[PDB]
Amino acid sequence: GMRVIIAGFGRFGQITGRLLLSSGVKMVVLDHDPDHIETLRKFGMKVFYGDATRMDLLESAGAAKAEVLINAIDDPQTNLQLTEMVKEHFPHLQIIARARDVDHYIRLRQAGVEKPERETFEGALKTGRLALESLGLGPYEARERADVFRRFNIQMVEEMAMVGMILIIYAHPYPHHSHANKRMLEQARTLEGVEIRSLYQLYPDFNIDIAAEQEALSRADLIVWQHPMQWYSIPPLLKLWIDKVFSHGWAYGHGGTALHGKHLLWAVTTGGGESHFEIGAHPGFDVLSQPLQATAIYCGLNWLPPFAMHCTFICDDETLEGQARHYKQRLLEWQEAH
Amino acid sequence: GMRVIIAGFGRFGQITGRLLLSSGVKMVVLDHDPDHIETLRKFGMKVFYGDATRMDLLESAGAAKAEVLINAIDDPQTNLQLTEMVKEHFPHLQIIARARDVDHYIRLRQAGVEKPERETFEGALKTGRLALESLGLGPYEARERADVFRRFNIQMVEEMAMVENDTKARAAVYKRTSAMLSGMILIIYAHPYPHHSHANKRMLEQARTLEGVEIRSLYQLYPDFNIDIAAEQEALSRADLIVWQHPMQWYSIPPLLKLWIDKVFSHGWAYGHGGTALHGKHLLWAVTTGGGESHFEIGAHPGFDVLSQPLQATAIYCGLNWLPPFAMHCTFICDDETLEGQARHYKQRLLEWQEAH
Numbered sequence: 253g254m255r256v257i258i259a260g261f262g263r264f265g266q267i268t269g270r271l272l273l274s275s276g277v278k279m280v281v282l283d284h285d286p287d288h289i290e291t292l293r294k295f296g297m298k299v300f301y302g303d304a305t306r307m308d309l310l311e312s313a314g315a316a317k318a319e320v321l322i323n324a325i326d327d328p329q330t331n332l333q334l335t336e337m338v339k340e341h342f343p344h345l346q347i348i349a350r351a352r353d354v355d356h357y358i359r360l361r362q363a364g365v366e367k368p369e370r371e372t373f374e375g376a377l378k379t380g381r382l383a384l385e386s387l388g389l390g391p392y393e394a395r396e397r398a399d400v401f402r403r404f405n406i407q408m409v410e411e412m413a414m415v416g417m418i419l420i421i422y423a424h425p426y427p428h429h430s431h432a433n434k435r436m437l438e439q440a441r442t443l444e445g446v447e448i449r450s451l452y453q454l455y456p457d458f459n460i461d462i463a464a465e466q467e468a469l470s471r472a473d474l475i476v477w478q479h480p481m482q483w484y485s486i487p488p489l490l491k492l493w494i495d496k497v498f499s500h501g502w503a504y505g506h507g508g509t510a511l512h513g514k515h516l517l518w519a520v521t522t523g524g525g526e527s528h529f530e531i532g533a534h535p536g537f538d539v540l541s542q543p544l545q546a547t548a549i550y551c552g553l554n555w556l557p558p559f560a561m562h563c564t565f566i567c568d569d570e571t572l573e574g575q576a577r578h579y580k581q582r583l584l585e586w587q588e589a590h
Numbered sequence: 591g592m593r594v595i596i597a598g599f600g601r602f603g604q605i606t607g608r609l610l611l612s613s614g615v616k617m618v619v620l621d622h623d624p625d626h627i628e629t630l631r632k633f634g635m636k637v638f639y640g641d642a643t644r645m646d647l648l649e650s651a652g653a654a655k656a657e658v659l660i661n662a663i664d665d666p667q668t669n670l671q672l673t674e675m676v677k678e679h680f681p682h683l684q685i686i687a688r689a690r691d692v693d694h695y696i697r698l699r700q701a702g703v704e705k706p707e708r709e710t711f712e713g714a715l716k717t718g719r720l721a722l723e724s725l726g727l728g729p730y731e732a733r734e735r736a737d738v739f740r741r742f743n744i745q746m747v748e749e750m751a752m753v754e755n756d757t758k759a760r761a762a763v764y765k766r767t768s769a770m771l772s773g774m775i776l777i778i779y780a781h782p783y784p785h786h787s788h789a790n791k792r793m794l795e796q797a798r799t800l801e802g803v804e805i806r807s808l809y810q811l812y813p814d815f816n817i818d819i820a821a822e823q824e825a826l827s828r829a830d831l832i833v834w835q836h837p838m839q840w841y842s843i844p845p846l847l848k849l850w851i852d853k854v855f856s857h858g859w860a861y862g863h864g865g866t867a868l869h870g871k872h873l874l875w876a877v878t879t880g881g882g883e884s885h886f887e888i889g890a891h892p893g894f895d896v897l898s899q900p901l902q903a904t905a906i907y908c909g910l911n912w913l914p915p916f917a918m919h920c921t922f923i924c925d926d927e928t929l930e931g932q933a934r935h936y937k938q939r940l941l942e943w944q945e946a947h
């Protein structure tokens with residue numbers, strides 16, 4: 253109220269709330285514990301007293317208009333009650349819900365909540381990482397092990413609840429803020445046989461699913477690395493995706509022939525024109541492709557001449573559109589030639 | 591037993607224990623809940639059934655020999671009781687502890703637990719992120735906002751763990767923190783697996799024998815890719831030579847070093863109007879490669895020296911004085927003589943630089 257209602261403002265709701273408050277989000281918060289209300293007021297937090305399962309209190313908190321309801325109620329039965337009421341009466345109100353445990357998670361999934369958050373799960377993973385670190389594992393390797401286990405465990409719990417092809421690897425860190433690439437992708441979508449995988453949408457925590465990515469690469473004939481140039485090179489997540497996905501025994505080495513015969517296009521946008529690259533011992537835009545070409549060739553790919561969209565610092569929306577067209581044109585040309 | 595004791599095998603201790611089983615960690619469990627017996631039997635887990643706070647149970651569990659005790663007990667008083675008993679009787683036993691909330695976190699910090707993990711804290715942040723995404727924020731930008739929130743939140747709770755339990759004091763800290771949220775050599779070391787390194791590890795050992803060297807191991811400091819820009823910029827402010835040291839990966843640099851560049855070389859600090867913080871400083875690329883020079887005969891622009899271009903261009907743009915790279919080649923097929931000698935040469939490069947400045 254205006255945009256978010258938070259039901260329950262104990263330890264869980266408080267942290268969700270304060271994160272949202274930091275971002276300027278306007279909210280209305282309900283909690284049924286009078287002592288919790290007191291302490292929150294001591295810290296200058298505005299919180300309303302009542303049972304969030306009461307329809308009258310939800311309506312006066314603005315449920316008919318709100319965009320998101322955070323269900324931070326601890327008790328499974330009440331938490332589920334709230335979720336079922338909201339689903340029934342407020343069909344546009346997106347519910348993001350805490351789950352006490354796996355049984356509660358399954359129930360919430362079945363009520364139609366997309367990604368219920370088991371309240372101790374991420375804390376218990378962190379504690380596991382700390383135990384690994386104390387036993388002498390490097391923190392990064394320990395984080396990676398926790399990532400593998402999380403992916404495995406979510407798959408398991410999800411199963412319990414149930415019970416001329418072009419692949420564009422897009423790596424813009426801020427897709428919603430893009431002008432040049434966003435337009436390029438709009439134009440590329442109008443083609444047939446184009447899949448787009450936006451790495452920063454898929455893997456905001458830098459935990460690549462190698463098996464998923466290798467499957468998508470299997471189905472592709474042209475692979476495209478599309479991104480804004482950053483510091484004469486590529487974004488961090490794309491470098492991570494290469495390091496992980498182009499794996500020993502798959503992309504290279506004995507038996508690693510998965511990419512043989514496929515083609516790779518570098519599609520990059522820059523803030524300067526060709527003039528900006530006349531610096532250092534090996535000047536010129538084309539020299540910057542070397543590490544990417546070498547990667548591609550090592551793994552048995554065919555490197556295509558890059559598509560380079562120059563001058564974005566000093567460019568208009570007209571020319572941003574002309575270059576988006578040249579991009580679609582490049583891709584179409586590839587497809588017809590194939 | 592052999593190395594780890596987990597006290598409590600509820601929702602929390604079960605996840606932590608299951609993660610360690612995937613790492614082949616030897617563990618024994620202290621639990622007193624009849625409903626967990628079958629779960630523990632199914633994993634083949636040795637269990638000492640009873641109150642974990644009992645000295646006789648702890649000794650039977652091997653506490654005098656264990657490296658780590660994971661205190662996953664839910665009840666804050668019982669969890670503190672076990673913490674205190676262990677600190678008193680088993681001086682070498684490292685305690686990793688669950689915390690119920692901020693008051694409990696503070697009490698564990700005061701009992702000498704280094705990094706108590708507030709049980710719902712990371713799950714609530716994830717929830718906060720899913721909300722932000724549902725309001726239209728991109729998942730990556732939403733994660734970054736959670737990282738900034740976390741950094742400040744931990745700072746605030748650490749400040750509170752030094753004041754007294756008194757609410758008005760704690761309240762002041764929160765208000766102050768909430769407002770806030772609304773020839774020296776510096777080696778930036780970026781091996782993803784420092785403990786597994788042979789060549790870089792030896793290079794660092796040698797560099798450590800010089801005077802005025804500081805090493806920041808990025809993958810130790812930031813395993814979650816959440817760089818603290820202010821801490822990095824402070825350390826750069828003190829350095830005269832900056833070294834980027836790492837194993838080469840796919841003809842280029844590791845992801846976390848690229849993130850460090852993208853984040854730390856900020857507009858108005860490293861470049862742009864007023865961005866002169868790096869002017870006068872020097873940069874050395876110090877890189878190890880598996881292949882020899884012959885390995886870089888690939889692509890339209892062959893040869894190792896070409897691969898420095900994006901890095902040299904980055905330096906020049908930020909007003910750094912680029913030095914000739916240090917490159918140790920042939921790690922795949924080099925001996926331990928060649929690998930100790932190359933590391934000595936690294937030390938010689940740094941020393942020679944110190945002599946000229």
Ligand SMILES: Cc1cc2nc3c(=O)[nH]c(=O)nc-3n(C[C@H](O)[C@H](O)[C@H](O)COP(=O)(O)O)c2cc1C
Pocket residue numbers: 424429430431432433434479480481482483484485520521522523524528564565852853
């Ligand atoms: C961290 C950072 C580093 C950048 N480095 C370069 C650079 O090396 N060369 C260049 O021409 N532009 C550089 N830029 C500009 C981007 O390439 C440009 O803003 C982008 O291509 C615009 O595309 P978009 O509208 O899709 O965001 C950089 C931008 C940022 C954020």
Ligand SMILES: Cc1cc2nc3c(=O)[nH]c(=O)nc-3n(C[C@H](O)[C@H](O)[C@H](O)COP(=O)(O)O)c2cc1C
Pocket residue numbers: 495781786787788789790791836837838839840841842878879880881882885921922
């Ligand atoms: C993901 C990955 C990519 C690599 N790419 C290259 C390569 O581009 N060229 C090369 O000569 N060595 C490459 N290597 C080999 C490493 O550079 C080499 O093993 C490392 O420098 C050894 O140093 P260390 O003993 O400190 O680990 C790569 C290694 C990994 C894991």
Ligand SMILES: Nc1ncnc2c1ncn2[C@@H]1O[C@H](COP(=O)(O)O)[C@@H](O)[C@H]1O
Pocket residue numbers: 259260261262263264265282283284285288302303304305324325326327330
């Ligand atoms: N029906 C309800 N309406 C509003 N708040 C609730 C309800 N049931 C539980 N709560 C609150 O949910 C919060 C849960 O605490 P915690 O487990 O610390 O997040 C407490 O502050 C409770 O008062």
Ligand SMILES: Nc1ncnc2c1ncn2[C@@H]1O[C@H](COP(=O)(O)O)[C@@H](O)[C@H]1O
Pocket residue numbers: 597598599600601602603620621622623626640641642643662663664665668
């Ligand atoms: N004194 C104790 N000794 C051993 N285990 C305990 C003790 N007190 C609580 N626990 C366990 O801690 C776990 C906490 O449950 P949960 O919140 O689900 O992680 C349960 O398995 C309890 O049996």
Ligand SMILES: N[C@@H](CCC(=O)N[C@@H](CS)C(=O)NCC(=O)O)C(=O)O
Pocket residue numbers: 262263264266267291690691692693708711
């Ligand atoms: N005594 C409580 C909760 C007390 C509480 O809500 N504490 C706040 C600080 S006033 C908290 O820990 N919020 C979560 C956090 O800040 O990490 C309980 O154990 O259920």
Ligand SMILES: [Zn+2]
Pocket residue numbers: 425426427428429727728729731
């Ligand atoms: Zn975005």
Ligand SMILES: [Zn+2]
Pocket residue numbers: 389390391393782783784785786
């Ligand atoms: Zn390591």
